[PDB]
């Protein structure tokens, strides 16, 4: 007799998916929903390269640590790469105020230019601007931060100083400075020629008075002294006024910046490359339209949702019965 | 199978049918061959393509950054930040695994339904002109050339033309 039969497809596929009723079902065709591979390198996000701090921390980079002279160049980045435990930060020991907040503010900046807010030669006629320290050594020589000046007395005097800066740059200007706390009154008289000093930093919305705290304290980086670091964001059209009769670590270079909200800092040991991506992880970068990944929870930008799943494969074909 | 065809009364699949998901196998004096049903295969491809597009493209991702830093007097806020991150990862993991499990069962049910529907379509066309073997096959009570087979597959099969010849063979048996 003559026969016609109804049947269905089969192939050599070894794909397996999981279903509600049965696990590990072999199927003819399937698609993967889970990205589980990276390229092991750092790529451009949003089209622009990231800032590699290398050996430095954000604290060392933004203050101008003598061992970070190579990082001053760049003025554009999308995210920041920092070593897990950075070796070069605040070479002179002290408390960096609101440091995490500052790292969040600097997480991404579209335009970022450095300019000498108080020129070293013109701004301090009656103060010594050459102060250095062995804790901030560069090439076996005592140095200091590039963006700060250690003001000490000249001709046996530390006169009252008053210095203002008006932000005419039509962008937020980041100003950093410091206050020095000597270990003993003797060092205080030698450096600033006074026992009671004060530092005042005020703007239209900022106001804080600093008083040196002289005490003996454990040696950090071979220094019993301390320099507390401070910062403020000066809005365009606003003035910041520095008044001090001692202990001020004055600003030399400031930063006019324009933000790029939503980015951040990653801790990675992965090398750099010229690739581009919408997603980058500390392990490496990722592509694909896949809506899920299990590479790393810490992502940057628009990334597939991280899931702990080891496998997310949905069937499109039939049960494979060859 | 939920509809009883795949791994049911049609016990196996055909590696010989490369052209489609569902199709036919015919045996007559002229020849033997595997043929694919392009209409029902295309419908299944369209539906499952839209199913994949739905799962993938409902997931819209804004440009964001998970990582945050905290000092030693901010432990409660660090743990609150950790509770947020772990909590969303918990939910999306559970949603993704459950979604894939359930919709994989529905997708295999879907093929079972399509095969069953194609078998009933042919059975509704042949009527008494053929008898059901039980394995997804029909045995014609009349002769059926390659043009007659192509009418069964195209759904343009004509019942009256072969009805009288089928009745005589059915009466003989």
């Amino acid at each position: 007799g003559d026969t016609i039969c109804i049947g269905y497809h089969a192939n050599n596929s070894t794909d397996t998916v999981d279903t509600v009723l049965e696990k590990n079902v072999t199927v003819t065709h399937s698609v993967n929903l889970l990205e589980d591979s990276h390229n092991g390198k750092l790529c451009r996000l949003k089209g622009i390269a990231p800032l590699q701090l290398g050996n430095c921390s954000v604290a060392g980079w933004i203050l101008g640590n003598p061992e970070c002279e190579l990082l001053i160049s760049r003025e554009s980045w999308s995210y920041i790469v920092e070593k897990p435990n950075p070796e070069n930060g605040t070479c002179y020991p002290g408390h960096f105020a609101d440091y995490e907040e500052l790292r969040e503010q600097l997480s991404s900046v579209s335009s970022f230019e450095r300019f000498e807010i108080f020129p070293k030669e013109s701004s301090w006629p009656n103060h010594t601007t050459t102060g250095v320290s062995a804790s901030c050594s560069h090439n076996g020589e005592s140095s200091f931060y590039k963006n700060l000046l250690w003001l000490t007395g000249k001709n046996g005097l530390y006169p009252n100083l008053s210095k203002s800066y008006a932000n005419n740059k039509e962008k937020e200007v980041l100003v950093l400075w410091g206050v020095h706390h000597p270990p003993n009154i003797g060092d205080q008289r030698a450096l600033y020629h006074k026992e009671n000093a004060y530092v005042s930093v005020v703007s239209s919305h900022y106001s804080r008075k600093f008083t040196p705290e002289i005490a003996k304290r454990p040696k950090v980086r071979d220094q019993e002294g301390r320099i507390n670091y401070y910062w403020t964001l000066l809005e365009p059209g606003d003035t910041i006024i520095f008044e001090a009769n001692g202990n001020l670590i004055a600003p030399r270079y400031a930063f006019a910046l324009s933000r790029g909200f939503g980015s951040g800092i990653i801790n990675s040991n992965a090398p750099m490359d010229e690739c581009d991506a919408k997603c980058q992880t500390p392990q490496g970068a990722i592509n694909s339209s896949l809506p899920f990944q299990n590479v790393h929870p810490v992502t940057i930008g628009e990334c597939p949702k991280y899931v702990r799943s080891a496998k997310l494969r949905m069937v499109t074909g039939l049960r494979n019965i060859p | 199978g939920l509809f009883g065809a795949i791994a049911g009364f049609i016990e196996g699949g055909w590696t010989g049918m490369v052209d489609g998901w569902y199709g036919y196998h015919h045996q007559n004096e002229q020849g033997s061959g595997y043929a694919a049903d392009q209409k029902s295969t295309q419908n299944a491809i369209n539906g499952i393509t839209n199913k994949v597009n739905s799962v993938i493209e409902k997931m819209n991702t804004q440009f964001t950054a998970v990582g945050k830093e905290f000092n030693k007097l901010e432990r409660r806020m660090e743990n609150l930040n950790k509770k947020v991150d772990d909590g969303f990862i918990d939910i999306w993991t559970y949603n993704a695994e459950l979604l894939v499990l359930l919709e994989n069962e529905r997708t295999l049910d879907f093929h079972d339904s399509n095969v069953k529907n194609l078998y009933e379509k042919v059975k509704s066309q042949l009527k008494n002109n053929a008898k059901e073997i039980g394995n997804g096959c029909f045995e014609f009570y009349h002769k059926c050339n390659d043009e007659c087979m192509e009418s069964v597959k195209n759904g343009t099969y004509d019942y009256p033309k072969y009805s009288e010849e089928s009745k005589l063979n059915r009466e003989k048996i």
Epitope: - | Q38, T49, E150
Partner: nanobody
């Protein structure tokens, strides 16, 4: 398995006309897309024309207005009517078929087949 056999390939003088035909062993009525590719020595494969199930047509800029693709459902044949031929149109023409519309590779790209080819030479 589906067989595609081209025919009509030969040499032709410029300004002439030629029709190529492609014979499919399986009914072409429900086939999603049927294509003509051309390949010249030292060149890549180029999409020349495409016919779709709905009756739509897509042509490359180079052959547009001079070439016409059409399918004869009854003869299971795909035609490429080439008019106003130029010497640059010299190529080996390839018949391609795609049974289904599968943008996401859902069905693994099944139902795609290639013809053997037919040489068209425009000279003198």
């Amino acid at each position: 398995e589906v067989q595609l056999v081209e025919s009509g390939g030969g040499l032709v003088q410029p300004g002439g006309s030629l029709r190529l035909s492609c014979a499919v062993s399986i009914s072409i009525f429900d086939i999603y897309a049927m294509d003509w590719y051309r390949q010249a020595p030292g060149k890549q494969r180029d999409l020349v024309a495409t016919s779709f199930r709905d009756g739509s047509t897509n042509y490359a800029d180079s052959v547009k207005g001079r070439f016409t693709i059409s399918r004869d459902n009854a003869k299971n044949t795909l035609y490429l009517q080439m008019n106003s031929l130029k010497p640059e149109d010299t190529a080996v023409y390839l018949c391609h078929v795609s049974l289904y519309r599968d943008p996401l590779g859902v069905a693994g790209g099944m139902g795609v087949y290639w013809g053997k080819g037919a040489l068209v030479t425009v000279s003198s």
